Symmetry: D2
Subunit: 344 residues, 4 copies
C-alpha cells in the first residue's frame, strides 16, 4: 500500500499525472490510494471544475498546498513553477519519495542555474530519464527524483546515442515544435485560443531558454568534449506535441549511425525506431509514453539529422515522472504506461 | 488593356492569385481583366465549385489547359507549383508575360534540376524575389518570370543580408514550419484533416527536399564561399504560414548583424524588422504579403539565429507572382498587395 | 477630412475596426483620419505589442480612455469591455458620430435589457444591420450607431426573409458554432490554447445567453406573430467565425422560400445565396464582410433549415461598424469592405 | 478463449479497435488473440505504415478482404463502409460472432432503408448501443451485433430518457458538431487539412443524412407516438469528437426532466451526468467511451435542451463495438474501456 499526493494538481502536468494513475494497476488493486490533491490555485473548489476529463475524481476538494496536507504520504508529486519546490522538499519528511516535475533539482552546475533562473541552486536529484545511461540504475529504489523538462527529454533522446558513440561533433542545432499545454496553464493573453490558432511563433530564442543548459548538461555526460546547443523553441497550434529536429555536422556514413540507435535502443520498450524510410509524427505518440525516432545524414552539407516525437505531457512530463516512480518503488517499470497513442 | 489568364486555377495557388487580382486597383479601375481560368482536371465546371470565397467569379466556367485557350492573353499565370510548365510556356507569344509558380524555370545551374527532379532542364527566367539584390532590375519589364518556392522565399529573406556582408558562416541550418496549404490540393491521405489535426511531422529531410538546393542558389548570389544547406520542413495544424528558423555560426556583434539588416530592408516597403524584443508570429502575416523578420546571436553556441514569418500562399507563391508582374508591367510594386495580416 | 478614434483599440474588435480602417479608400486618399487609440488599462504601450498585424500603425502609443482623449474627433469607436460605455458615450459631444460595438444600445424594450444585462437601460440608437429592412434608411446620415452582436447578425440574415414573407412559424431554433475570437481578449483559462484546441462545447444554454433577445427583437421587426427563440451557441477550435443552423416549422414549399430569399438579397452585395446543392462554410467568408446563406427544406419533419456563415469579427462586429459608418458619412456602402474572404 | 480478426484495419474505425484491444485485459491474459487484419487496396503492406500509432502491431501484414482470411476466428470486427458488410456477412460461419461497424444490419424497418441507402435490405442484428432500454439483454450472448453510428449514439443518449417518460414532445431538433475523422479516410478534397482548419461547414442537412432514420428508430423505440428527427451535422476543426445539441418542446418541470435522467443513468458506468453548473465538452471524453450529459429547460421558449458529448471514434464506434463484443463473449462490459478522458 502506497499513499500519494499531487502538489499542483490544479493544472496540466498534475492532472495528467492523476490520469495516468487512475489507469495504473497499483490503484486498480488497492496498492495505491489517491490522497491529497493540492494547489494555491482555487482551493475549495472541486477537482472536476478543473479536469472534466477525470470524473472518477471529480468529487475531491483541493486543499491548500501546505506541509500539513502533504505529510502523511509515502509519495508526493510536485508540479510547480520553479521556486516553490526547494522550500517544500525540506518541510517534508525525507523518508518520502519526492518527484519534482519542476526544474529546482535538475542541473548540477550552480553557476549555470543562477544565470538562467535568477535564484540560488537548491541541489540536484537523479534525472527522471531512465533510457539515458546510468540514469536507470541511480533511479532503482531512489526516494527523490527530478523530472526533465519536456524539450530536453526530446532533445536528449534524439541525440545521445550518436554523441555517446562518437559519431557527430558537439556543436548541435536543435529546433523543436510544441503544443501550448507544455506552456503551462497560467492564463496569459499570448496563450488564448484566438492567438495560437493559426500561428507559429518562436519564443526565448538564441540560447536564452532555461531548457538550453539542460540539453547541454545531459549531452556532456556522454562524451569528453564540451558542448554547445543552438536551441530554438517553436509554439504551434496543438494542445500536445514535441517534434524535435536535431542536426550536427558529421563525417560518418548513415549505415554506421543506424547501428548506434539500434545499439542504444534494442531493449528500450518506450523507444521505437522508424523502419528505414519512415519518420515519427507527434500524433502517433499522443497519450502514449513512446518516443518515435528516426535518423538520416545529409552529405552535401556533412550534416547528420535526428528526429524525435513524444508527448510533451507523457514522456516529457507526467509519463517520465510515473516511469521514474515505477523504478523508485521497484514496481514494474512499464506499469501505467502505454506505447500506443490516441491517434488521430 | 492588359488581360490575364491563370492555369491550374483549381489549385490553392491559382485561387490565391485570383483572389489577389480581384483586389488589384487595376481590376477596380479597369486596366486589367480576369480572362481564361484553366485547369488540368475539373475542366468544365464553375470556379465556385472550387473557391467559395471567389464568389464574384464563382459563375465563370473552367476550360482545360491548352495552347489555344491560354493564347489571346496579354499575360498568363502558370500555377502548378508542382505540375510542370516548361512545355506550355513554350507555346505562347514571347511578348506576352508568363509567370510560372511551378519550379521549372527558377534554376540557373543545371546539374541540380535533374539531380532533384530527374528530367530535362529548361532555363532560368528572372527570379521573382524583388527584395533579393539585383533582382528588381532583372524584373522591371520582363516577359518571363520564375516564382520561388514557399520555403526558399523565407530562408533567403532571413539569411541573405547577413551572408552578403559576410557576417555569418556560409554553412546554414534551416528548420521551417508550414501549414498544409503549401502541399497543394492534391488530395492524399496523409494530408487529411484528422491526420494533420493535433500532429506535426518532418518530410524530405537530409536535404532531400526539392527546395533545398534552391536556397543554395539563392545565397551563392551574395557570397563566393562554399554554401551548404541543412534544411528540414515541418508541417503543422495550420492552413497558411511559414515560420523559418535559420542558424549559422557567427563571430560578429549583434550590433553589426542587426544593422546590416536595417540597412538592407529600411527602404524595402514590404519587409519589416521586428522591434527590439518582439518576435515574428506567422499569424501576423497571414492573408498579406508581409515578411516580418528577427535576428539575434546565440553567444555560448556562437550561432546566429534568424527567423522569418511569411504567408506560404501570398509571398510564398501568389503574392510574389503579383508583386513581380506589377514590376513586369511597371506599376507601383505595392499596388493591390497589403502589409496588414488577417488576424486573429 | 474626418478624424476617427478607437476606444478598446487593443481588443479584438478594436483590432479589426483598425484593420478595416486601414484598407479604406478614404484612408488612402486622406478623407478619413486615424487618431486616438485607447485601451482600458493599457496606457503607454505601443500598438504593435497588442496587434503585430497592424504594422503601419504599430509605432503608436496607447492612451487612456477618458473623455479628455476622445474629444475633437469626428467619429468615435467604442469596442470597450461590453457594459459601461453609455457612460462615456454621453461624455462626448453629441454632433459626433458614435459607433458602439458594445451592447449598451442595441435593445428596444427596457424590460428585456434589465432582465438579461442588469443595469439601468440606456436607450436605443440605430441598430446597425443595413441588410435588415427599414434599418438602412435610419443609418443614413445618423450620428449614433449600435453594432449588432455576432450570433444575431447571422441569425437574422438567415431567418428574417422566410419570416418577412411569413412562410415559417415564429418559433425559431438556433444552434451556432463560432470561433474563439468572439469571446474577446480577456485572458481566461477556458479560452487558452490547450483548452479550446481539439474540443467543442456549448455554453449559456436554454435561452440565457444574452444574444437571444437580440434575435427575437430583430425577428419581431418583420412579423406581428409572437416571436419565440431557442438559441444555443457552441464554441469550437477556430479563431474566427460563425456557422449558424436555423430551424423552424414550415407550411410552404422550398420553391416559395427560395424565391423569397433571392428576392431579398439580390439588391444586397454583401449577402450571397448559395447555388443549389451548396452550403456555406465559414472559411469561405473569413476576413471579408460576406454572408453565405442556404435554404433547404426537411419534409419528413415539417421544418425549414437556413444556414448562414459569417465572420464573427467583420460582419458580426467590425465590418458592420464601417458599413454603417459609410452610410452615415455619406460615403458608398460597400466602401472599404470586401466579399473576398481569405481561404484556405 | 477467443481470437479475433479485423476487416478494414487501414481505416480509423479499424484503427481504433486495434488500439482498444491491445488495451483489453483479456489480451494481456491470453484469452484474447489478434488474428487477421484485412483491407482492400493496401493489402500486402505493413499496418504500421497505416497506423504509426499502433507500434505493438506495426509489423503485421494487411491481408486482402476475403472469407478465408477471416475464416477461422471467433470474432470479426468489420470496419468496412456501407453495403460491404452484407455480402461479406454471408461468407463467415454463422457460428462466428460478427461485429459490423456499418449501416447494413442497423435499421429494423425495410421501407426506409431502401429509400435512404438505395440497396437491398439485409436484416437487423441487435443494436450495440447497450445503454438503451432492453438492448443490453439483446446482446448478452449474441453472435451478431450492429454498431450504432456516431450521431445516433449521442442523439439517442441525450434524448431517450426524456421521450421514454413522455416529458418531451416527439418532435426533436438535433444539431451536432463533429471531428472530421467522422467521415473515415476517403481522401477527397473537402476533408483535406487546409480545407477543414479555420472553417466550419454544415453538411447533408435537412434529413438527407443517413443517420436521421437511425436516430428516429431507437428514438421511436421508447415512446408511444411517432417521432420526427430534424437532424443537422456540422464538421468542425478536430479529429475526434461529437457535441450533440438536442432540442424538443415540453411543458414539464426541469426537476422532473432531471430525475428522469438521474434514474436512467446513475446505473450506467459509461454515461456521465454533469454536476449542477457544468456542461459537457468533447475534449473531456476524448479517448474514452464515456458520454457526458447535461439538460436544461428554456422556460421562456418552453423548449427542452439535452446536451451530450462523446468520442465518435470510441463511444460512437470502436468502444461501443468492443463494449458489445465484451457482452457477446460474456465478459465485463467495462474491460479495456475507460471512462477517464485524455485532456487536453
Ligand atoms: N464579436 C466581438 C468580439 C469582441 C468584442 O469586444 C472585445 C474584444 C476584445 C477584448 C474586449 C472586448 N465585441 C464583439
Amino acid at each position: 500500500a502506497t499513499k500519494v499526493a499531487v502538489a499542483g494538481a490544479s493544472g496540466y502536468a498534475g492532472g495528467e499525472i492523476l490520469r495516468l494513475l487512475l489507469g495504473h494497476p497499483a490503484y486498480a488493486d488497492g496498492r495505491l490510494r489517491i490522497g491529497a490533491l493540492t494547489a494555491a490555485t482555487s482551493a475549495g473548489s472541486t477537482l472536476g471544475e478543473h479536469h472534466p476529463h477525470l470524473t472518477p475524481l471529480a468529487h475531491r476538494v483541493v486543499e491548500p498546498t501546505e506541509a500539513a496536507v502533504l505529510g502523511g504520504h509515502d509519495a508526493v508529486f510536485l508540479a510547480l513553477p520553479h521556486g516553490h519546490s526547494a522550500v517544500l522538499a525540506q518541510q517534508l519528511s525525507p523518508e518520502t519519495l519526492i518527484i519534482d516535475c519542476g526544474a529546482d533539482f535538475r542541473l548540477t552546475d550552480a553557476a549555470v542555474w543562477e544565470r538562467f533562473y535568477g535564484s540560488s541552486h537548491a541541489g540536484s536529484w537523479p534525472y527522471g530519464l531512465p533510457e539515458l545511461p546510468g540514469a536507470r540504475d541511480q533511479l532503482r529504489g531512489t526516494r527523490r527524483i527530478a523530472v526533465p523538462g519536456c524539450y530536453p527529454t526530446a532533445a536528449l533522446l534524439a541525440l545521445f546515442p550518436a554523441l555517446a558513440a562518437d559519431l557527430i561533433e558537439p556543436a548541435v542545432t536543435v529546433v523543436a515544435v510544441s503544443g501550448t499545454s507544455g506552456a503551462g496553464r497560467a492564463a496569459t493573453t499570448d496563450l488564448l485560443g484566438a492567438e495560437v490558432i493559426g500561428s507559429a511563433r518562436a519564443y526565448n530564442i538564441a540560447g536564452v531558454h532555461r531548457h538550453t543548459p539542460e540539453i547541454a548538461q545531459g549531452l556532456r555526460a556522454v562524451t569528453d568534449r564540451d558542448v554547445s546547443v543552438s536551441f530554438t523553441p517553436v509554439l504551434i497550434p496543438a494542445s500536445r506535441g514535441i517534434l524535435a529536429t536535431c542536426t550536427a555536422r558529421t563525417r560518418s556514413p548513415l549505415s554506421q549511425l543506424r547501428a548506434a540507435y539500434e545499439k542504444a535502443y534494442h531493449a528500450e520498450p518506450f523507444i521505437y525506431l522508424m523502419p528505414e524510410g519512415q519518420l515519427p509524427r507527434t500524433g502517433a505518440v499522443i497519450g502514449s509514453n513512446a518516443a518515435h525516432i528516426a535518423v538520416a545524414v545529409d552529405e552535401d552539407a556533412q550534416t547528420f539529422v535526428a528526429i524525435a516525437a513524444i508527448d510533451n505531457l507523457v514522456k516529457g512530463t507526467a509519463g517520465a515522472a510515473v516511469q521514474s516512480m515505477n523504478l523508485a518503488l521497484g514496481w514494474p517499470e512499464t506499469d501505467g504506461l502505454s506505447v500506443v497513442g490516441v491517434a488521430p
